[PDB]
Design a protein around this nucleic acid. Structure first.
Lengths: 128, 128
DNA sequence: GCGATCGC
DNA sequence: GCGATCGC
DNA sequence: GCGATCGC
DNA sequence: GCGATCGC
DNA sequence: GCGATCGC
DNA sequence: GCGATCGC
């Protein structure tokens, strides 16, 4: 299921992921959407890996993460969340598509993707 | 001056480049001819590369060279010749075109391509 | 069964 | 790309 | 991620 | 040569 | 300069 | 894929 990525993203402050635990979480940063716009991805995993790689290459974004977390994002790994936002062994930050694929939701549509904590993700799926 | 590969090639024994220092040297192995037949080449420089890389991929042939030589062939570089067959900084085997493009010589016609030693290529360009 | 990340 | 994991 | 394989 | 992509 | 290979 | 070198 390949395809290209599209989207405008939103502007973000000094606490990007700060609300990744409420509602639909945090959005794709504008600067990041540009680096990835019109690009081409194999699978969604391919996207996730690149997204986090791009995050670690953005000076103002990488400044909000712990040294180890930055080392993680540099090789496609997702940053770890605060203790209170994990869910058992699920402790990384996850990407979520607002509208599923079954509802014609764009899989590589950055405006349809946001960053949420595992804890929140489980609620979002339960309906809360 | 790009082009496509072509030619039949001739069957080579176990001592392929054992006469590369006489006459016109060893011919382009049939097996290599087949594996290379009709291929997009940007320059003869590129063909040399792909050629030797194809020589290292052919078990029967790669067997005739030391490890240092296969390392080279693996990256498109030709095997170094014995010391008595080199000349100056030229220590590796060189591809020889029997006919120039002027005389309708195949620039990518394996049948018009052979492998000769530096000390021999020099004796061919002076008059046998 | 299902979304979603991990590691080669 | 593939095989495996995790919580529901 | 690590070994192939582009691309200049 | 070697950094940068592909293809598992 | 010519026919080739080297060195990124 | 481009310059740069090689020996004559």
């Amino acid at each position: 299921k390949p395809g290209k990525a599209t989207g405008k993203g939103k502007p973000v402050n000094n606490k990007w992921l700060n609300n990744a635990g409420k509602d639909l979480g945090s959005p794709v940063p504008d600067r990041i959407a540009n680096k990835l716009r019109d690009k081409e991805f194999k699978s969604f995993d391919d996207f996730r890996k690149k997204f986090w790689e791009e995050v670690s290459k953005d000076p103002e974004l990488s400044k909000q993460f712990s040294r180890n977390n930055n080392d993680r994002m540099k090789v496609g790994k997702a940053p770890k969340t605060r203790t209170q936002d994990v869910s058992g062994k699920r402790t990384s930050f996850e990407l979520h598509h607002e509208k599923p694929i079954s509802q014609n939701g764009g899989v590589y549509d950055m405006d349809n993707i946001s960053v949420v904590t595992p804890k929140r993700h489980i609620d979002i799926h339960r309906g809360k």
